[PDB]
Amino acid sequence: IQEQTMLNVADNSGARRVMCIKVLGGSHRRYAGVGDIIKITIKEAIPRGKVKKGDVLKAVVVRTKKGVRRPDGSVIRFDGNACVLLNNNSEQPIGTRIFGPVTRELRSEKFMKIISLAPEV
Amino acid sequence: AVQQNKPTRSKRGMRRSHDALTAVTSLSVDKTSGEKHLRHHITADGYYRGRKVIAK
Amino acid sequence: MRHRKSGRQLNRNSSHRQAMFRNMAGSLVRHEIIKTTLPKAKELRRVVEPLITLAKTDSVANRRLAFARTRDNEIVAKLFNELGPRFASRAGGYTRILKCGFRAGDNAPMAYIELVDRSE
Amino acid sequence: SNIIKQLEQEQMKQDVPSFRPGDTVEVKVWVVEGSKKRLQAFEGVVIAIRNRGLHSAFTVRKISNGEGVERVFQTHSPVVDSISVKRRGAVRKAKLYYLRERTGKAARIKERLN
Amino acid sequence: MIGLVGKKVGMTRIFTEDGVSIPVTVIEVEANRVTQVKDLANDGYRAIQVTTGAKKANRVTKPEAGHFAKAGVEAGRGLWEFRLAEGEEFTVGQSISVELFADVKKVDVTGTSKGKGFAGTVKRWNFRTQDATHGNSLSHRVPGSIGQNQTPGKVFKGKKMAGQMGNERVTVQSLDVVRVDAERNLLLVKGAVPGATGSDLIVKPAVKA
RNA sequence: CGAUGUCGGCUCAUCACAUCCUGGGGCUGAAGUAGGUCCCAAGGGUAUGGCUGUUCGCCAUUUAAAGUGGUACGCGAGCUGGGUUUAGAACGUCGUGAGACAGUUCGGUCCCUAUCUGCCGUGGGCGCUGGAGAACUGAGGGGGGCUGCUCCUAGUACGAGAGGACCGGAGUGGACGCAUCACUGGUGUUCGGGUUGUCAUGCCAAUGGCACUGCCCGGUAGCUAAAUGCGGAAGAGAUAAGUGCUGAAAGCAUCUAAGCACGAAACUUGCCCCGAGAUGAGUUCUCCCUGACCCUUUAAGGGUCCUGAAGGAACGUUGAAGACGACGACGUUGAUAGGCCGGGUGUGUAAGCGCAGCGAUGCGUUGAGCUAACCGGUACUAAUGAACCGUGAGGCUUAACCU
RNA sequence: AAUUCCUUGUCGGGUAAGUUCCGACCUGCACGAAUGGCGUAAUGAUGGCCAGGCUGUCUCCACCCGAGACUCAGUGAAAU
RNA sequence: ACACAGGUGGUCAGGUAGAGAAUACCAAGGCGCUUGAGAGAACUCGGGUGAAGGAACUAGGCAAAAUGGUGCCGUAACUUC
RNA sequence: AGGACCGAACCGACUAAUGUUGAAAAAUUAGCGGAUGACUUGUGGCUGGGGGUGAAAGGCCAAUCAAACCGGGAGAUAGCU
């Protein structure tokens, strides 16, 4: 979310704990956590995941403890901070299957595949 | 911090121009005893408006 | 800032404020007229007058609440037996403040706070 | 003032069901993907607010697949079509934040001629 | 176009059937009775003076009472002025006045902002506090340098320092009207307007829109 | 040299333009996209990290861009002391040795209550020509001027293909600024509850003190941001580099000499704030005062008595105003504060009694009891009648008007 | 290397990024065996580095509670 | 130098909780520290609590935050056992 | 048994903040080290200035130390201000 933020991975190919090295989009953007794309290092990885430790690639935040605010004032708060790993050049999901809840805020462009694969929207 | 040159007695008076006390300009007179008191205050013999409010 | 806020700190902590208002309310119930500085009298209205509004209804739980505040059983007994019937028809304003002269030791605006239907 | 709590009263809906915190309520919210609208079910334990008028809300928590998703929904919003009380749970606190934050620990049900 | 004077009576919501929950500020616009019209002959400009509210007639001073009694007797809490580019208004009052805001879609609301007192630099401007823990003898939220040694030898006039914030006029522009309710005498505007509750607000049609 | 603190970082800046981005153009070895180079242009904007004491530099990842310089290599009576730059100690080298190094390593006290200028805020006196209460005109001054991405034009122009428009539109963001608290939250020592240890109210029960608010759990008002609304514009004038029309000097020719039309985020307006102490003190509306005497060194004055006007000031209850002044509401023809009644909110079924249980405890009464700063009502308490300040028709010269 | 100027030498390692660190190589300006050379369990308010927990250190500040600061009464300095 | 937040040898040692001369609340006993009264700005000192992130701060985790007791399991590389 | 371990009194002084015309001519508040010993403290005594004493720092020798303080030479000298 912020820089120096550890996140869980929703998708399978992305592995375990990941850290946000940069908040992409914006000159001095401090905090971005709803549908935003963040540059990611892999701080710890299982070997079954395709990506490995020390590798930089993009991600999109899917779950935030801060939570989205709906238009009527509703706040959906998800426990845990989660990301879906994306390729640096393509920004397309590496993982074949997305796990856990997703929000309807991730309905734009390449995130349609994420909400298609993920069970609960 | 410290002054670089000594201020004049003129500057002292100009600063003390606003340190002038204000008089009362009106002392209220009670009806049942014509002694003067501060307005909205007891008469120092024990009366407010027409009645003996405090015995002391 | 202090916006739409009530209560006067009176340059003391909250424990000292509650202790002074308990002792002060007990003194006002016992003597029925006391001399105190004017801000303290204005804040005293808000601790003495709820006790009399409690004391208009006489019950075991109400006696316990008026004991938990002010912690003095003689003040509880006076509040429920003597006052209460003294103020039952009266709808508020049991305490009345009369501004008096300035204190000699320090120039404090002083006042007399008294129960309204005091005999003398 | 007075002109608010009249303006707010004309917007409030009077069919809100009554439910204490600790209950497990199912709410039906409208999701509009295109021109089509469908009801969506959210069931979970509640940490409620008492009726602040039109500006009222309830938060429910559900552990979907190991992740506790928590939804505040406005009471009198047109999004919330229906609330169903379902299970009634006996709790001792108005806000159940500690009792929701744990995983695998659930609000108990006691029915003492409730 | 001319504007009206209202008292802010708080903020609430209008829940649309979609679910937008438009956040609104309710403004109570009474009948704004015209006190004086100024023209290019007697004065230098075209305006109408406007009174609204009521006053107890004990606090009405005799000069103000004579001003009201000339050109239609009325009791009002204050006088506010609105200039006209093109319109023509009579010296008697307007009976119903909020209806001119029914057709308009954006308004500008001008009010006295809530006073914050003697406000620091960190509160007043968005000045950054120096680091609390690493040393920092008594210079946490203080202003830092205000100047540049001998060569200016002075502090510039537009310097951002501590001072009063609030109790000053501000204008908020391009605010959508949600609903103008004439019999309730209410003007519902999207968003947040200046003032505390109960304060006089002048609302005008949007100059930008 | 009878003392001008040293690099760097933090906070806060301000200027120049030799312009990094955005804006306007010329040439191009400029097909488009993207470039190179030069001219105009300072309105705004112009990164976060690993390393190191570092400015630097290198590196990771951004961005429209991560400008270059001046300001005692800006800024220590603003902060820091990592560095050089004391006194302890060691290593390498030099010297017999004391010690030394334009080498290294560890440690190593950073004072000031602001007189004057300067700024930032807020007031008293007087002036503005009789004195008041309000509304203004705007001479000036300040603020604000950023920009990304997706789509339509349009796969159109252009193009061997690959690719692909730097006109005109619409949406949605990053950064910034202003306001506000309806939502989402944060705080909430002045609300409710749980509970440890002890002391006390005789005792059981119920409470209160103290232990950071004892430790917590929630929390009203208010303030707030991370929450929500909005804005930087459009337009007009005059322009800069540039582009021209007509057109002689110089029969042609030529943007200029006579004329004329374009042209940028620069300038002046337009938007927002202060603003007639704007001594150049302005305007408009309304209110209020039209009595005698004495002396006189008479453009002029002084005094006496009677009279005190509109209004202000004071005093009190106070405020979403406030350091204090100041500003706003109210003063018995009263809702200005506190209290009181009702509601809302918040906490979570009080005390007592009964029942069950060996007991802890449970159940009923009971969503009970307390509840603030909130909302709506109510003169119960305090806002007393005065008293004070302010006066009694306002100078002199000259013009349309009437004696 | 508490020593190496060049130098941030070069290989392996740790981070997205490592002038610091570890194991080293030997091209040791200018290590070296009681001016001790090299290792070493324990110990250290010792030096350097990494990680987990933890958090207002920070992003980026916000509220509240007390003592000052402000106002009033009494006493009443200083450097310059 | 002061009716100065410092220094000053020895003796006695109640209850409850507690290992305790810690610490908390209190006995006996002594005190409120010789200026007060208001308001509730900035800023300073001493605290409490903070959404999300969590060392991105910084010369450096400086400072805060954190862990903490008894009983019982268990527990290494190297070792001078 | 332990120049053993955790830790009050006691001894010391590692970091930070406040103070720096202080409450204090080195203290306060949180943490810190040692705490049966190369420990600590009371009362006397002994060592005297180019001398003492030093688990060594130019440390200490009465708020004074690369040679204390007090009086004398002494009105040293001063090409310097």
Curated annotation (Swiss-Prot), chain E:
GO cellular component, one term: cytosol
Gene3D superfamilies: 3.30.160.810, Translation factors
Single GO BP term: cytoplasmic translation
Residue ranges of the TM segments: none
PTMs per UniProt: Methylated by PrmB.
UniProt GO molecular function: rRNA binding; structural constituent of ribosome
Modified residues (N5-methylglutamine): Q150
N6-succinyllysine carried by residues: K38
UniProt entry keywords in alphabetical sequence: Methylation, Ribonucleoprotein, Ribosomal protein, RNA-binding, rRNA-binding
Domain of life: Bacteria
Subunit structure, interactors included: Part of the 50S ribosomal subunit. Forms a cluster with proteins L14 and L19. In pull-down experiments interacts with CedA.
Family, per entry: Belongs to the universal ribosomal protein uL3 family.
UniProt-listed HAMAP family: Ribosomal_uL3_B
The protein's role, per its UniProt record: One of two assembly initiator proteins, it binds directly near the 3'-end of the 23S rRNA, where it nucleates assembly of the 50S subunit.
Protein name per the record: Large ribosomal subunit protein uL3
